[PDB]
Motif scaffolding. Structure first.
Motif, PDB file in Angstrom:
ATOM      1  N   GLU A  35       6.493  -7.134  21.722  1.00  0.00           N
ATOM      2  CA  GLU A  35       5.589  -6.103  20.794  1.00  0.00           C
ATOM      3  C   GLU A  35       6.588  -4.974  20.042  1.00  0.00           C
ATOM      4  O   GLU A  35       7.541  -4.815  20.552  1.00  0.00           O
ATOM      5  N   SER A  36       5.899  -4.735  19.033  1.00  0.00           N
ATOM      6  CA  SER A  36       6.500  -3.887  17.991  1.00  0.00           C
ATOM      7  C   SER A  36       5.503  -2.648  17.716  1.00  0.00           C
ATOM      8  O   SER A  36       4.223  -3.119  17.477  1.00  0.00           O
ATOM      9  N   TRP A  37       5.817  -1.448  17.750  1.00  0.00           N
ATOM     10  CA  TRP A  37       4.581  -0.227  17.514  1.00  0.00           C
ATOM     11  C   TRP A  37       5.541   0.608  16.375  1.00  0.00           C
ATOM     12  O   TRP A  37       6.756   1.002  16.547  1.00  0.00           O
ATOM     13  N   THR A  38       4.688   0.733  15.058  1.00  0.00           N
ATOM     14  CA  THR A  38       5.577   1.609  14.151  1.00  0.00           C
ATOM     15  C   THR A  38       4.895   3.023  14.122  1.00  0.00           C
ATOM     16  O   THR A  38       3.643   3.109  14.120  1.00  0.00           O
ATOM     17  N   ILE A  39       5.804   3.841  14.334  1.00  0.00           N
ATOM     18  CA  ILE A  39       5.285   5.425  14.355  1.00  0.00           C
ATOM     19  C   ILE A  39       5.645   6.066  12.869  1.00  0.00           C
ATOM     20  O   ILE A  39       6.602   5.411  12.297  1.00  0.00           O
ATOM     21  N   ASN A  40       5.100   7.145  12.800  1.00  0.00           N
ATOM     22  CA  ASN A  40       5.362   7.898  11.491  1.00  0.00           C
ATOM     23  C   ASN A  40       5.827   9.376  12.137  1.00  0.00           C
ATOM     24  O   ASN A  40       5.232   9.879  12.886  1.00  0.00           O
ATOM     25  N   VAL A  41       7.063   9.789  11.767  1.00  0.00           N
ATOM     26  CA  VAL A  41       7.674  10.928  12.080  1.00  0.00           C
ATOM     27  C   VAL A  41       7.645  11.822  10.802  1.00  0.00           C
ATOM     28  O   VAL A  41       8.355  11.448   9.929  1.00  0.00           O
ATOM     29  N   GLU A  42       7.257  13.025  11.161  1.00  0.00           N
ATOM     30  CA  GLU A  42       7.471  14.183  10.023  1.00  0.00           C
ATOM     31  C   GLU A  42       8.756  14.339   9.470  1.00  0.00           C
ATOM     32  O   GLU A  42       9.626  14.539  10.271  1.00  0.00           O
ATOM     33  N   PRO A  43       8.756  14.371   8.091  1.00  0.00           N
ATOM     34  CA  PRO A  43      10.148  14.862   7.646  1.00  0.00           C
ATOM     35  C   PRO A  43      10.539  15.893   8.226  1.00  0.00           C
ATOM     36  O   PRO A  43       9.457  16.979   8.271  1.00  0.00           O
ATOM     37  N   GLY A  44      11.853  16.374   8.328  1.00  0.00           N
ATOM     38  CA  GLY A  44      12.359  17.752   8.848  1.00  0.00           C
ATOM     39  C   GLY A  44      12.230  17.927  10.244  1.00  0.00           C
ATOM     40  O   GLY A  44      12.689  18.628  11.005  1.00  0.00           O
TER      41      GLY A  44
END
Length: 207
Positions: A35-44
């Protein structure tokens, strides 16, 4: 920034993502093999980490335990994990650039590749069989290969005063994984990437 987290291991892992005082994205999720899980990490984001957790049990509320990398018994981590944990570490949009590394300073549980998916820099990898080869005194009975600070709690291993050297134990991690940090004052293996790069973290990148 996007981080695709891919579990290429033959076993399930519970991915985790935190900056120590907060979750990154949902903070954690189960990843079965493949499996693959894509996350979003805030800039900075400064001082972010991604790691795998093994042999976890969670109830319907998201509370439980893992044998490696447990973050306060939560599926959705808000805090860093219990060693031993191979660490994908990053600070994003730091004066125009991103900085990435892999660290064994908190031990090793699962092999990992941490690479950009956008141009302008290399990835790093620690994919040797550190658990299999682990010195007897560092083996975690719960699973994994502890760092020497965790095991022995000395100034020298923990670099508490800021002027520690390499050790027989750090050298083991460094021999198996030259491109990962082996102790706090190791010669850095941090890669500079363009600011706002995107990444993939692959558990068990090689067979």
């Amino acid at each position: 920034a996007t981080f695709e987290i891919v579990n290429r291991c033959s076993y399930t892992v519970w991915a985790a993502a935190s900056k120590g005082d907060a979750a990154l994205d949902a903070g954690g999720r189960q990843l079965n093999s493949g499996e693959s899980w894509t996350i979003n990490v805030e800039p900075g984001t400064n001082g972010g980490k991604i790691w795998a957790r093994t042999d976890c049990y969670f109830d319907d509320s998201g509370s439980g335990i893992c044998k490696t990398g447990d973050c306060g018994g939560l599926l959705r981590c808000k805090r860093f994990g219990r060693p031993p944990t191979t660490l994908a570490e990053f600070s994003l949009n730091q004066y125009g650039k991103d900085y990435i590394d892999i660290s064994n300073i908190k031990g090793f549980n699962v092999p990992m590749d941490f690479s950009p998916t956008t141009r302008g820099c290399r990835g790093v990898r620690c994919a040797a069989d550190i658990v299999g080869q682990c010195p007897a005194k560092l083996k975690a009975p719960g699973g994994g290969c502890n760092d020497a600070c965790t095991v022995f709690q000395t100034s020298e291993y923990c670099c508490t005063t800021g002027k520690c050297g390499p050790t027989e134990y750090s050298r083991f991690f460094k021999r198996l994984c030259p491109d990962a940090f082996s102790y706090v004052l190791d010669k850095p293996t941090t890669v500079t990437c363009p600011g706002s790069s995107n990444y993939r973290v692959t558990f068990c990148p090689t067979a």
